[PDB]
């Protein structure tokens, strides 16, 4: 069978906590020489995967003593003592011997205190207007938890269509999240209304955070 199964898929943890990630093989994987070629790799957003541990318990250069590997036969474990903000990312176990195989990965995420988003709204640039388009942009930065919804208002009227949302990966320093929301309209449409509003509904308030502008400024 020799598939590598990781538990769990997602590992939410608070700073200072102990993190434990399991990796089980469907068959014993010790090589004939008595050595077990089981490694752990970490991949952070925007970077290449990188080596943490090899031959079950050996730490690679530049890796914090906080990362420790153990296990035998079919059960292997990567332990991160005293989790820190920059430890977030996707951890993967990997069998390096015949038919090298990756486990499915475990995404380590940080749990922290709530934080309200810093909201900024922007009118369409004159350049885009020239091309006949009109995108209104809103940034909701450095907030927590990740769950949040945006509400666009045009002259007080709610608008849901034509909105494009994107969220950043969790911040490795402050552990917060940020999101961008772009409402794209046609120049003609944009020109018929005056008030544009960006509103965020996050559990850090019973009353959303509103930000807006008038095509009159």
């Amino acid at each position: 069978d020799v598939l590598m199964t990781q538990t769990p898929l997602s590992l939410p943890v608070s700073l200072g906590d102990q993190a434990s990630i399991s990796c089980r093989s469907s068959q014993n994987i010790v090589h004939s020489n008595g050595y077990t070629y089981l490694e752990w790799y970490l991949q952070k957003p925007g970077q290449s995967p990188k080596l943490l541990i090899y031959t079950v318990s050996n730490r690679f250069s530049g890796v914090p003593d906080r990362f420790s590997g153990s296990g035998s036969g079919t059960d292997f474990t990567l332990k991160i003592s005293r989790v820190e903000a920059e430890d977030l990312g996707v951890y993967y176990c990997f069998r390096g011997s015949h038919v090298p195989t990756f486990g499915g990965g475990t995404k380590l995420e940080i749990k922290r205190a709530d934080a309200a988003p810093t909201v900024s709204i922007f009118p369409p640039s004159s350049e885009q207007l020239t091309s006949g388009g009109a995108s209104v942009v809103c940034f909701l930065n450095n907030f927590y938890p990740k769950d949040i919804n945006v509400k666009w208002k045009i002259d007080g009227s709610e608008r849901q269509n034509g909105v494009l949302n994107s969220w950043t990966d969790q911040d490795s320093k402050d552990s917060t999240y940020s999101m961008s929301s772009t409402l794209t309209l046609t120049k003609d449409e944009y020109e018929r209304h005056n008030s544009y509003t960006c509103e965020a509904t996050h559990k850090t308030s019973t009353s959303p955070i509103v930000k807006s502008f008038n095509r009159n400024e």
Binding site: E39, V90, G96, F102, S135, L164, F213
Partner: protein, 221 residues
């Protein structure tokens, strides 16, 4: 210093094939197994196969037999991977990595990765729009500025501020695809004492269309 340099982003049509490279330097190319890994979003990491450059002996995962073909040229210390009969399932970031022995037994060094997009959509350069606050009354001690990057294909685009000197307080959001066109954005928050007093420019690079776009953020009205 061990280095693995991979070739650039590729946009290939369904059914076609692509051949990418991994130039090795800083060690004896022929003494180590070179490995190839697939990184498709939502799939994790997948082992494709490996080649021993010294004699080109290869071993492949069953899933990639007949899909991937690994080669190597010792005179140029370069390893290659050709992917054939491309489908959208082959759109991914592909890495090469060296398998070490002695001081370590694992993939210790990795290339920066080669992004591949399989699609029949046309290449389009990025439309870059500067984002300045609508009013002066919407500017306090700190000011957030931005750049909206629309209508480009294929990904990726890279964004910097003031040629990289402005790195603090930056948020560059993942690109989102909509009808064969990508959209991404980047915000940067700076002291009102520095802007518009000092210039702030976002720099956008789109190697896939060999284009670079610089847009200065200036106050509206």
């Amino acid at each position: 210093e061990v280095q693995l340099q991979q070739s650039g982003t590729v946009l290939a049509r369904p059914g076609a094939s692509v051949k990418m490279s991994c130039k090795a330097s800083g060690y004896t190319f022929t003494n180590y197994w070179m490995h190839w890994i697939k990184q498709r979003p939502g799939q994790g990491l997948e082992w494709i196969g490996t080649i021993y450059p010294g004699n080109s002996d290869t071993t492949y995962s069953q899933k990639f037999k007949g899909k991937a073909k690994l080669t190597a040229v010792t005179s140029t210390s370069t390893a290659y991977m050709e992917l054939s009969s491309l489908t959208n399932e082959d759109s991914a970031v592909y890495y090469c990595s060296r398998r070490n022995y002695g001081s370590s037994y694992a993939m210790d060094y990795w290339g920066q990765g080669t992004s591949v997009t399989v699609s029949s959509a046309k290449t389009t350069p990025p439309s870059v729009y500067p984002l300045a606050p609508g009013s002066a009354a919407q500017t306090n001690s700190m000011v957030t500025l931005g750049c909206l990057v629309k209508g480009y294909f294929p990904e990726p685009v890279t964004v910097t501020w003031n040629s990289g000197s402005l790195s603090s307080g930056v948020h560059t959001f993942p690109a989102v695809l909509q009808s064969d066109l990508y959209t991404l954005s980047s915000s940067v928050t700076v002291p009102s004492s520095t802007w518009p007093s000092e210039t702030v420019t976002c720099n956008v690079a789109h190697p896939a269309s060999s284009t670079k776009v610089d847009k200065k953020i200036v106050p509206r009205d």
